[PDB]
Design an enzyme around this catalytic site. Sequence first.
Site, PDB file in Angstrom:
ATOM      1  N   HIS A   1     -10.496  -9.709   0.442  1.00 17.10           N
ATOM      2  CA  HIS A   1     -11.305  -9.751  -0.784  1.00 17.10           C
ATOM      3  C   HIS A   1     -12.480  -8.762  -0.862  1.00 17.10           C
ATOM      4  CE1 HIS A   1      -9.826 -13.504  -2.945  1.00 17.10           C
ATOM      5  NE2 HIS A   1      -9.082 -13.463  -1.853  1.00 17.10           N
TER       6      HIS A   1
ATOM      7  N   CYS B   1       0.768  -1.241   0.000  1.00 15.87           N
ATOM      8  CA  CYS B   1       0.000   0.000   0.000  1.00 15.87           C
ATOM      9  C   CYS B   1       0.801   1.294   0.000  1.00 15.87           C
ATOM     10  CB  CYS B   1      -0.986   0.023   1.189  1.00 15.87           C
ATOM     11  SG  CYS B   1      -2.194  -1.344   1.253  1.00 15.87           S
TER      12      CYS B   1
END
Lengths: 368, 359
Positions: B187, B141
């Site tokens: 997910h 990230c």
Amino acid sequence: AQLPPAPPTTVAVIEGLATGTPRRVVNQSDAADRVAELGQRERIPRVYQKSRITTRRMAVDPLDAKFDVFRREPATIRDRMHLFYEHAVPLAVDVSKRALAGLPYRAAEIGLLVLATSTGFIAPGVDVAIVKELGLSPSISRVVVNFMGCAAAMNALGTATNYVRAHPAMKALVVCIELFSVNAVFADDINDVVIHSLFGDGCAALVIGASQVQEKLEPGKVVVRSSFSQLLDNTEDGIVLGVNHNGITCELSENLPGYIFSGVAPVVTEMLWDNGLQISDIDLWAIHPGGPKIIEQSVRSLGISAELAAQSWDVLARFGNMLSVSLIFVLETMVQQAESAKAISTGVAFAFGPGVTVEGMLFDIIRR
Amino acid sequence: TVAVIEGLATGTPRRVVNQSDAADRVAELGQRERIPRVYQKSRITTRRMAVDPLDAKFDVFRREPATIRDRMHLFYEHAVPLAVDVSKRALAGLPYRAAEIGLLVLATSTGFIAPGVDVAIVKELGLSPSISRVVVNFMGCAAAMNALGTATNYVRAHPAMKALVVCIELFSVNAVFADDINDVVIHSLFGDGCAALVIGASQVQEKLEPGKVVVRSSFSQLLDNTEDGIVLGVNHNGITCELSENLPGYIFSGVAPVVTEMLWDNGLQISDIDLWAIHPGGPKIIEQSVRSLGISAELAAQSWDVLARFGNMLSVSLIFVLETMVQQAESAKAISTGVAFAFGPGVTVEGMLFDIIRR
């Protein structure tokens, strides 16, 4: 007056160099026989005797009784990456220290750490282990370079370079670690058979600093004069890297040698010209020991004496091809023993990465 | 010398996915009551996906083992187009000739192939064959900050040159939808996306035109005993991220101390910043960052919004946010001072001090 700002005026220097490899020694002939035992297994001896490798170091013993079962199962990629992290940390940390032992720089002076690999890939990795292990700064900068192939060392050393010239007072640590043994699979195709016969495990670290040209560097120091790249037009299939369920793999084209022959000469010539030099003016040729056909075709392209590729042939002979690390092994040799009697030896280094990119540099080794 | 973001462009795969639906389609795969729960708490309304992992075609392939290679190929197949269009658009606005671009940095954590997107970009855009290239993998990230740093250093060593930073994150290609809770969370959060930047050096003097972003300072911080926080790995059927239950807490007690020192080193206080490009890594990530800084919940609007519309697109997300801050000013002042930061593996806080020229 919105002209570009004046450029930095220093030069990157490799003030510290260090190399290391796992302890296990694998004698090529034995390796051949062991693998030969996995109709007609004549293929094996054949390719192996052509490798021009005598020994290679391996973190893991692929054909070992334990590993041999694991080696033949599917979906083991996540375990191999762990296995990678496991064997790499010790080695990477040990080499990084050796590289720093000589220098008096304090941990606060090291502002960048560059880690290159094409055989790894793990969440927090070897880069973080290195910082903690050596007690570097929690605020140190880190860049991880992956899948750049045999020439990663160059892309890595360049990252350091810019950093150092941009922050003259700081130093940078470059580390390349390559453990292919952890990726061994021993499949049937020639590419696999070849790859598994060429690759070895090893590690290397460089400590970089910025220096003004008026400064009188001490012997053993290596100046990075120029850097260069070249996407060899229409050679994409030359070197391919990919991840398989059972490990990282490398796919080389039958034409790689040909691409090199055509690519090397022009690239080096143009670069040398920019620095007022010609192939005949180069004392040292740190050609990436990626294999016989690579050294072989690299020397033909430049049209130089076979002898001028001695160091390269040596590394490949004693350690095989340990990817991005190899380049540095070759350089080390050159730094330990002079090829002539002149103060300052000039040399070119270059390797080959995916897309078939020539990555290299023009350097000077202060002799006295 | 000054590092300036002179170009900025974002892109994303066409397919839009509404969390409400996703939740339902996903749920249908004994205690599926959990799925709607996690998705409601996601605070994500939509996210783009290069592929529909639930598509009839895909569904069979994704239930299969040992498929990373094909998956990595899929990455390349979708990554290239998107990354190319985004680069062209980031350069489109500038008057630079291909010869002025001397460095290309490519960051990802969701795909590994060589030759890769970086090469496809050079060729596609007609960039010089001798351009320098650095591929930044697995920094998660916060890769955008690592990438951006590599670009400023370059441009600082070669002022007359420009550098192109490209981030492509395509989680959908790694979609597996497994049983464990982490896979469920992971997910329900990740989206696909790409973003590019054009960096150049500039004389401390020079008056920059509006929109230009001056990268004042960048920073890093490896947080003690946090290694378990964010974990990336490569499985036989895809790449994954393994977030720890201790992450938000790490964030809560980690952000403030770093930011504060960094600011103090620049003669600033939290109360001085106009913009806060908090990486929208998830509701808690944004939550704890805000709380750690003790700032108005509203200062994290841009982040929340990006999280709402695109979900987490890893390193990409941080640039979407910045773009919003560039496109829409938060006050009538000439020059907006903001701080940006994301979190990466080992649990490293990476960010930057920056100014957005307004007038």
